[PDB]
Symmetry: D2
Subunit: 144 residues, 4 copies
């Protein structure tokens, strides 16, 4: 009231429109749109054993849709990696890896800088970012 | 993959059925019913700036209903106190939540609700926040506990 | 800056002088002295796998000394309970820690040490660890509280 | 009772001997050596308001030594960044920490130290604190990771 979490990032540029999904109990699924860059980014979180759709950050862009369906609570994200009209940095590519050894991605275009967040202990419990159009910047909330 | 929180309590007895609302961003409202003990207990949580109603832990008992509306996020609980002990109207012979009192950082006292008999319990919080309630409910609130986060 | 933890309590009075050991990795040992109240109270903490004696909060009252040696990391506290109230030997009628009891996840009970008189307090821990103690000491233990972490 | 923290990383390779300082209250000072890669890496932590030197991870290499003195508690790290990659001076193409840069909430930049060659890595902290370091050291700093807390 209001509880807080460890927040890392963002990786990308000053948008665009800033958004913060806040924090939850975990992640059950993630949905993205990809081609040149990452367009749409949405999350279906876990909230105390139930699914909870996070606010939509959709891009209208004609990009391919992907669905990352984790075996929650047995399977979780151990890493978020990727690449970062306007010369402002945007999210070009995203990769996600799990504790069970499954690699989802790379999606988009691996160009420009590069970012990597390996997680040894803890969990991603929420996403933060900037969506114009497309995904400009992305960040994570962490908790034990 | 399920995030966890510090969990303290429960205060009360092993009767009824165990429930756990889980954890959220904070507390907006507490609704309870009382008479000589605590009946119903339901919470409206904050979940990332929006109201999120927790599961209801309703009692069919003809008790008086009360709404504890906190001025979230400026105002939050700094203590949860009360009394637990057997209740003579029975048929449960194990302790039950007889009374509850909530105090905030703004200096507001809510309660006592119920009947102040049995063993007193007090959780003063010096640093951190209640983010969820856990308990046991039968015909009454048998036990109560809390999740804490920073 | 300075990292923080969840802090609960204190239980007891406002007498003596306030102290806070701060927070560490866990608890290895608790040393206390008792008779009709709690006198001395010192802790040997874990700090990243090494022992770290915290500050001493010694009483010069000839009480019985006891060493609570916890089998760290397998063994940890699941509850701190006790009694607070004024003590016959004045010149202050402020409530003091009259008794303490410690229970572990391995079903070990340490105490009650002291005199089980006044107001009982109980902190059952369902999820999390005590990582530090805070309190107040004058001639004896006036108040006690804990830091908790995951 | 072993308390845990969020641990991110490591960044770098599998060479050297793995180490973990564990977690503390905060960071007071960072001592490192550098030339074409990072050599030595030693931290002075804060432990409940007092300085606590962690274990040394000293490189035998004739490198340039530097002290990053942080104005704890008001000044703390908001960023750790650098470069990771193979080093031509080595018999193995195992990636090592080539460069390090540290940024504080007070707008102070420390570095870049070393060679800005290989794979760039960046850890911005929007909320929370670095409370400990973990890594791998042989002749050089092969890997680096961080413990985080609120
Ligand atoms: Cl291309
Ligand atoms: Cl390419
Ligand atoms: Cl007496
Ligand atoms: Cl007696
Ligand atoms: Cl007696
Ligand atoms: Cl007596």
């Amino acid at each position: 009231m209001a509880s807080q979490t460890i927040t890392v990032g963002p990786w990308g540029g000053s948008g665009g429109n800033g958004w913060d999904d806040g924090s939850y109990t975990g992640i059950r699924q993630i949905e993205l749109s990809y081609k040149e860059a990452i367009g749409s980014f949405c999350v279906i979180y876990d909230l105390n054993g139930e699914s909870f759709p996070g606010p939509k950050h959709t891009s209208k862009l004609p990009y391919k849709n992907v669905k990352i369906e984790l075996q929650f609570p047995e399977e979780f994200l151990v890493s978020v990696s990727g690449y970062t009209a306007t010369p402002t940095p945007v999210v070009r590519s995203l990769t996600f890896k799990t504790n069970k050894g499954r690699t989802f991605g790379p999606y988009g275009d691996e160009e420009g800088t590069y970012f990597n967040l390996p997680i040894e202990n803890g969990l991603i419990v929420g996403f933060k970012g900037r969506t114009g159009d497309l995904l400009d910047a992305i960040g994570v909330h962490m908790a034990l």
